[PDB]
């Protein structure tokens, strides 16, 4: 429908907290810190344990509690396909995203999922999903985003352009791509 107004997703509607990202320190530098302090070691062990970049997003899964079957995206390799792939999602449904990743060498500080929504070259939203900090390990990690509700659409029932990326406090660009989502009725 006519969308001349939508260029104004209200104010940012933000509440960013002034947080200074942590200086860059390596796990080795971390364990060689206070090595005479037993408790610290138990503390570091309780938290870390015992051709690839540091982080690798395996896939996003859309946890929808209405229509059977999963809903995933294989964030591995060929991503151009997403630009011609079409995705639908019923109106105002209760959903949540399941981000699954894997950390390899160092620590990921403040990893986050940023999702810009577009409707004719008009960013009508910027949502940030704080995933968190994690240590390296073989077992992948899985993080569920808070419960949510898709928009209504006697108005916003058109197709949209979606640009996503995974970054963190170190402003590292772990992943990024664009896809197309559409809101139907059934």
């Amino acid at each position: 429908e006519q969308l001349a107004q939508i260029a104004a997703e209200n104010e940012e509607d933000e509440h960013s907290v002034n947080y200074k990202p942590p200086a860059q320190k390596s796990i080795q530098e971390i364990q060689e810190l206070d090595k005479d302090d037993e408790s610290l070691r138990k503390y570091k062990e309780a938290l870390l344990g015992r051709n690839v970049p540091n982080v690798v997003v395996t896939g996003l899964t859309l946890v929808c509690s209405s229509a059977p079957g999963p809903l995933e995206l294989d964030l591995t390799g060929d991503l151009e396909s997403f630009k011609k792939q079409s995705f639908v999602l019923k109106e105002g449904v209760e959903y949540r995203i399941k981000i699954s990743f894997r950390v390899n060498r160092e620590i990921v500080s403040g990893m986050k999922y940023i999702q810009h929504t577009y409707r004719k070259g008009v960013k009508i939203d910027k949502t940030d999903y704080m995933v968190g900090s994690y240590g390296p390990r073989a077992e992948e990690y899985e993080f569920l985003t808070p419960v949510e509700e898709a928009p209504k659409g006697m108005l916003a029932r058109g197709s949209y352009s979606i640009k996503s990326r995974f970054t963190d406090d170190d402003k590292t660009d772990h992943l990024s791509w664009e896809w197309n989502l559409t809101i139907k009725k059934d």
Partner: protein, 189 residues
Amino acid sequence: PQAIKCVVVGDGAVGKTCLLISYTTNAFPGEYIPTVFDNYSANVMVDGKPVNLGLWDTAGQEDYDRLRPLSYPQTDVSLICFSLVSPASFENVRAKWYPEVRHHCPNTPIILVGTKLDLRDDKDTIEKLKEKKLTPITYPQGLAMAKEIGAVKYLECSALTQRGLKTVFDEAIRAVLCPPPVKKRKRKC
């Protein structure tokens, strides 16, 4: 029972370790006190139901600024601690901890805790402090700081005399068990 994970942050020497030890053992440790109290879950029965409270003590040193946050994922309640007889650590709640905890734990209840309640009256304390143009932290002050970082409750306690130390963890659990209804944020458009 049900598992509620609790993390305890705050400046060094505020009393986060002695707080967790005086709570789990029912006795104040004096001389020997580890930098970090080992992770421990305690069985408590608040409001007629058992709970598996997982207590985490961290290292407030800025030296571990990147390591510490690895404990925030999966947390249900965070306690920002500060000494009542340390104006420094107080100012440090809005400057360091609140921004840290909130940024790593959005939509996670926060409890502000003023430790060392037993030192608020002590003569000696109000002197070496009283000679630096500094006075002890008042209750209204902490209450005000709470209202400011948006904490669900303000509590004061002392590990030494174990005063009010019981309510701090009852309130933390009460904050996770049955809190107010979220506003259903991010409700697109």
